[PDB]
Subunit: 260 residues, 2 copies
């Protein structure tokens, strides 16, 4: 006795989940980050650096708090009989976390560094943040570490989901929806960073983190498969609404930084 909801109640949860993402204005043509990334003629080192620092911290927290949420679910399953449908969905979350922690998918391990240098927030720090940091003053660099409030609110939302047995499903459900558009926006943003009139990212291989995410998302037991009763279903939709809105406000904050 433990199993997913029937496939009809689950499909309704998926449709309500898609509607929360619509209402949060996270779609490609909605969110100020994707619009700005398309619209701006150029991007200063300071602005690109700041956005890169915020992203580094957001993706580090996304990965660790998603794994923590999986652990919370594992605590439960240690003392229940999860059926095989449930276990398949648990495996999926594990496999997906593995992309960011160890480049599990072949599209990542074909280009990412091995060992801890390949952890996505570290690989980002090494190849995106550090070259930008060479073109900003030490005072600029300390200011960027002072995260804006919408970024702090999102990290606080992730800390709360780290304890939630549905937390890893909520986070992956939303992030996988928007990951493609974020990575395309980064490709465009850092393609437009000029320092000495010369591009800061002038070599193809410097975009390897971004192009790998674009490739993986283009090609890439779903997340509602971890919902085991009606009350959890309601809780899932509620956490998706909160989490999606915080993501949208954090990306609007990227967009704001690139404009005005």
């Amino acid at each position: 006795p433990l199993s997913p909801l029937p496939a009809v109640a689950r499909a309704e949860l998926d449709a309500r989940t898609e509607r929360e993402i619509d209402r949060a204005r996270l779609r490609r043509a909605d969110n100020g980050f994707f619009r700005s990334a398309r619209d701006v003629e150029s991007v200063s080192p300071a602005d690109g650096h700041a956005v890169a620092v915020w992203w580094r911290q957001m993706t580090k927290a996304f990965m660790f708090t998603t794994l923590a949420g999986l652990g919370a679910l594992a605590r439960d399953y240690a003392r229940r009989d999860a059926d095989r449908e449930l276990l398949g969905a648990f495996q999926t979350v594990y496999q997906v976390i593995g992309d960011d922690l160890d480049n599990a998918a072949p599209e990542f391990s074909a280009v990412a560094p091995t060992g801890p240098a390949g952890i996505h927030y570290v690989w980002w720090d090494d190849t995106i943040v550090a070259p930008l940091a060479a073109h900003v003053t030490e005072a600029d660099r300390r200011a960027a570490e002072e995260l804006p409030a919408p970024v702090r609110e999102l990290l606080a939302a992730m800390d709360r989901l780290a304890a939630e047995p549905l937390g890893s499903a909520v986070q992956l459900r939303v992030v996988e929806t928007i990951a493609l558009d974020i990575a395309v926006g980064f490709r465009r943003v850092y393609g437009k960073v000029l320092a000495g009139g010369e591009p800061v990212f002038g070599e193809k291989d410097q975009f390897a983190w971004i192009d790998a995410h674009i490739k993986a998302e283009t090609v890439h037991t779903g997340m509602t498969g971890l919902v085991t009763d009606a009350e959890r279903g309601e809780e899932f939709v509620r956490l998706v609404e909160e989490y999606a809105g915080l993501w949208s406000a954090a990306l609007e904050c990227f967009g704001d930084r690139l404009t005005g």
Copy 2:
């Protein structure tokens, strides 16, 4: 501002660790389960089934509580800033426990069923418990689910290490050391289970779970003792390391008693 202990102080913790494993009597020649598995001549369907049920629940709890311990460490790392050598040993936990959940390593991915049927406690249930179950009575299947006290005490400790930031490191450092001996014990024991006159497990493929473990668990033991990306590489201060040895003692001890419980059931 987070890093492991210096190499010297770590290889010292590694030595105190291998010594608590010694004292615990978990070595190939000191634990009653490994001796009995080799020594006994025959094992009844009912006795082999009972141990198979116990092992199912023990390994199920090991995987999930070790995963939960990794989650509790992740929750810490989301707040702090772990240097790369810490992150490296973190990756090892994810990689090692990942085989029980996903059969990533090549020894397993060849033979393991795909998807959830390959989860190791499920694969054990399907290929060891179930064939035995067909040769025991309903009352035997009921009685085997009521776990003996030494097994329950181990499970209860895993439930506590599940919320411990050092919990995955403790459990993997001990279990991966003894895993090979346990798997070799099971190969002996379930070769000697006879029902109706002849063995329950006749074909070589019926040992797939055990055989794959005998091969793979050599490298897993080497992964948890590696002096760069090994389990003591997750210890960040001298106090934490003291807690590590306290918990390894507790855990190696409960693992030894639980395994002796297997041996007694096999002998009488």
